[PDB]
Design a protein around this ligand. Sequence first.
Ligand code: MG
Ligand code: MG
Ligand code: MG
Ligand code: MG
Ligand code: MG
Ligand code: MG
Ligand code: MG
Ligand code: MG
Ligand code: MG
Ligand code: MG
Ligand code: MG
Ligand code: MG
Ligand code: MG
Ligand code: MG
Ligand code: MG
Ligand code: MG
Ligand code: MG
Ligand code: MG
Ligand code: MG
Ligand code: MG
Ligand code: MG
Ligand code: MG
Length: 148
Amino acid sequence: DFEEKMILIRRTARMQAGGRRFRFGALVVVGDRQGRVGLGFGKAPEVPLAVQKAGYYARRNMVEVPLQNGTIPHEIEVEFGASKIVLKPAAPGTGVIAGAVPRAILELAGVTDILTKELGSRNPINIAYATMEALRQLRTKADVERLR
RNA sequence: UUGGAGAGUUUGAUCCUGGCUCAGGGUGAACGCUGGCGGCGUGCCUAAGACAUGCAAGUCGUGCGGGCCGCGGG
Ligand SMILES: [Mg+2]
Ligand SMILES: [Mg+2]
Ligand SMILES: [Mg+2]
Ligand SMILES: [Mg+2]
Ligand SMILES: [Mg+2]
Ligand SMILES: [Mg+2]
Ligand SMILES: [Mg+2]
Ligand SMILES: [Mg+2]
Ligand SMILES: [Mg+2]
Ligand SMILES: [Mg+2]
Ligand SMILES: [Mg+2]
Ligand SMILES: [Mg+2]
Ligand SMILES: [Mg+2]
Ligand SMILES: [Mg+2]
Ligand SMILES: [Mg+2]
Ligand SMILES: [Mg+2]
Ligand SMILES: [Mg+2]
Ligand SMILES: [Mg+2]
Ligand SMILES: [Mg+2]
Ligand SMILES: [Mg+2]
Ligand SMILES: [Mg+2]
Ligand SMILES: [Mg+2]
């Protein structure tokens, strides 16, 4: 089994005659701390259901991150909508330098030393998606020469 | 490559834009409450406004001629 971290849990409303009615949403990252992470956004009429549902998708949508001594292979920058994440390789003594959202995802991915920066919109959901699709675009010296 | 964290706030809810605001470090500081010691710093950013009193530039008789006192003695 993997480790789970709930990043975001929010309540949203819809309007009807007689009043608003609610629904909940859960951002959950999932990982083994060895190079496998996944992200899922689960919504349901009560919190624990949504959280569990978030767990499910998190396992369905995974990604393999090419760790190297606990850092990522190259600098990467990715935009998701107006949200932009910046990822930069870092040496042993560094630590994971990131906001709560991208930290959780990187941390569970087995990243131990990295430099990051949130730019543009800092919408937690869009930043989480952006971080994922950034990890998903990480390549290795192997991958590179193999392609070319 | 030794280096980069963000959060609150427009909505019934959403994404975006955008401003405001906060957490950090800094000071020749001041103000409040409080106040035991020591070291190293450091102390009129305002009126280059006005200043009592003392002191902050003198030395040389191995450049010269004297005044006064004094020591030796003609
Ligand atoms: Mg966005
Ligand atoms: Mg854009
Ligand atoms: Mg490297
Ligand atoms: Mg923005
Ligand atoms: Mg914001
Ligand atoms: Mg790969
Ligand atoms: Mg650099
Ligand atoms: Mg910050
Ligand atoms: Mg308001
Ligand atoms: Mg409006
Ligand atoms: Mg409101
Ligand atoms: Mg803002
Ligand atoms: Mg301060
Ligand atoms: Mg005081
Ligand atoms: Mg006092
Ligand atoms: Mg002393
Ligand atoms: Mg002193
Ligand atoms: Mg004065
Ligand atoms: Mg002055
Ligand atoms: Mg005057
Ligand atoms: Mg005057
Ligand atoms: Mg004197």
